[PDB]
Design a protein around this ligand. Structure first.
Ligand SMILES: OC[C@H]1O[C@H](O[C@H]2[C@H](O)[C@@H](O)[C@H](OCCCCCCC3CCCCC3)O[C@@H]2CO)[C@H](O)[C@@H](O)[C@@H]1O
Ligand SMILES: CC1(C)[C@H](C(=O)O)N2C(=O)C[C@H]2S1(=O)=O
Length: 265
């Protein structure tokens, strides 16, 4: 593999699309590798980590319980609801909805949680509350995936998302139990986690959330490190590429491979 930045540049030229990336030290917040870190990219389902953070904040404040069972109707369901479509009769707990959102990319589960935090405007208010003045959510699932060229709606930057993920997981803004829960949901990802593990060398920790949208939009937010320890936050977004899903996945994997190959720096 080339140097990480070398590989990122190659990925851009090969995809004919824009890549944004940050590698951040989890412990200190130091930015190690950065590419288009201040440019905007659609969040897609990566927003669900921030969403579940806002839910956990309500739990901490006594305004919510993970145990609380939410009942919903078929008319509330949107496109891609692999878990929520199964529970029209018996409902789902807030915690279950969070797990389905993060680990399964369940879009209806995400919308149900989004309602509880005051919709996109409420989640954006939460982001401002934790010191993120850049990330914004404007729409619900699935319109938030539209990824129109130059549209600032439903976007983050690699640098803002990495800082925000660090704040949620480690800054003690969330309670100890809530920090642990948010991490565990990411550890439990069923969309990409097991596939990623299958191609990681022995000893590499992974926790993640993925997303996909229109016009080639693709993304991952992850915790990664050797010696079975979450050492770094890695955030990678792609936008405005006509490439196959397979090649988008392969390019993101290649950036990851470059980071692993050139880890010690
Ligand atoms: O010398 C370091 C390592 O180099 C290779 O590991 C390869 C591995 O065989 C390959 O499958 C992976 O592809 C990359 C797959 C990573 C998954 C995507 C990463 C995601 C999640 C984390 C954030 C970025 C995106 O690269 C590494 C590094 O070259 C060797 O196979 C392995 O024995 C050795 O320990
Ligand atoms: C699983 C996905 C490819 C993708 C993912 O998590 O990779 N999710 C979203 O952002 C919506 C769902 S999806 O498009 O079905």
């Amino acid at each position: 593999s080339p140097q990480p930045l070398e590989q990122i540049k190659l990925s851009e030229s090969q995809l004919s699309g824009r890549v944004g990336m940050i590698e951040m030290d989890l412990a200190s917040g130091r930015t190690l590798t950065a590419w288009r870190a201040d440019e905007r990219f659609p969040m897609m389902c990566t927003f669900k980590v921030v969403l579940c953070g806002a839910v956990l904040a309500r739990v901490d404040a006594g305004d919510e319980q993970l145990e609380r069972k939410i009942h919903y109707r078929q008319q509330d369901l949107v496109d891609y609801s692999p878990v929520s479509e199964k529970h029209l009769a018996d409902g789902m707990t807030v915690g279950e909805l969070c797990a389905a959102a993060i680990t399964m990319s369940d879009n209806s589960a995400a919308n149900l949680l989004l309602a509880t935090v005051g919709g996109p405007a409420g989640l954006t208010a939460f982001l401002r509350q934790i010191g993120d003045n850049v990330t914004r959510l404007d729409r619900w699932e699935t319109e938030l995936n539209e990824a129109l060229p130059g549209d600032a709606r439903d976007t983050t930057t690699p640098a803002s998302m990495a800082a925000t993920l660090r704040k949620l997981l480690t800054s003690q803004r969330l309670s100890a139990r809530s920090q642990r829960q948010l991490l565990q949901w990411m550890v439990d990802d069923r969309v990409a986690g097991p596939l990623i593990r299958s191609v990681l060398p022995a000893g590499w920790f992974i926790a993640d959330k993925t997303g996909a949208g229109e016009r080639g939009a693709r993304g991952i937010v992850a915790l990664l490190g050797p010696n079975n320890k979450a050492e770094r936050i890695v955030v990678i977004y792609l936008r405005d590429t006509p490439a196959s899903m397979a090649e988008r996945n392969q390019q993101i994997a290649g950036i990851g491979a470059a980071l692993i190959e050139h880890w010690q720096r």
